[PDB]
Design a protein around this nucleic acid. Structure first.
Lengths: 64, 73
DNA sequence: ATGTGGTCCCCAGT
DNA sequence: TACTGGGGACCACA
């Protein structure tokens, strides 16, 4: 897993390196997925959504 | 404006974006989130490996494939 | 300086 | 003709 350091002086957010190349680290959820996702996020009591998808990925480790 | 449909889904009556937010147990939330470098790397991996075009589907799949944990919360 | 979470403004597409 | 997915920028922060 890698990172790509920003080039511009306007946005300094890092991108990540995936199978399809540099990707921006934001995702958009659809309205039904948002509500279910945020269900989980508020249940675990996590402040930042990203910690909720770390949880959702630990579990599901049987993705393989 | 509020619509009941799922749950409660707020329609922005603004004008530079008709993008709609969702009403959560902690108020109006945006449907766009910023994954940490650490998370994004693992999240996109499973998106690629499922071949899903749009990454919202991947979160749908995660939740699908993890209700065995979600209910006991 | 160089990243961070998070969201605004807005383009192109569903 | 209403909403969306995502890029580009940006405020406060660290």
């Amino acid at each position: 897993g890698h990172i790509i350091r920003a080039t511009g002086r306007k946005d300094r957010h890092s991108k990540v390196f995936t199978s399809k190349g540099p990707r921006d680290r934001r995702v958009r959820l659809s309205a039904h997925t948002a509500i279910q996702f945020y269900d989980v996020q508020d249940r675990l009591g996590y402040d930042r959504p990203s910690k909720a998808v770390d949880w959702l990925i630990k579990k599901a480790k049987t993705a393989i």
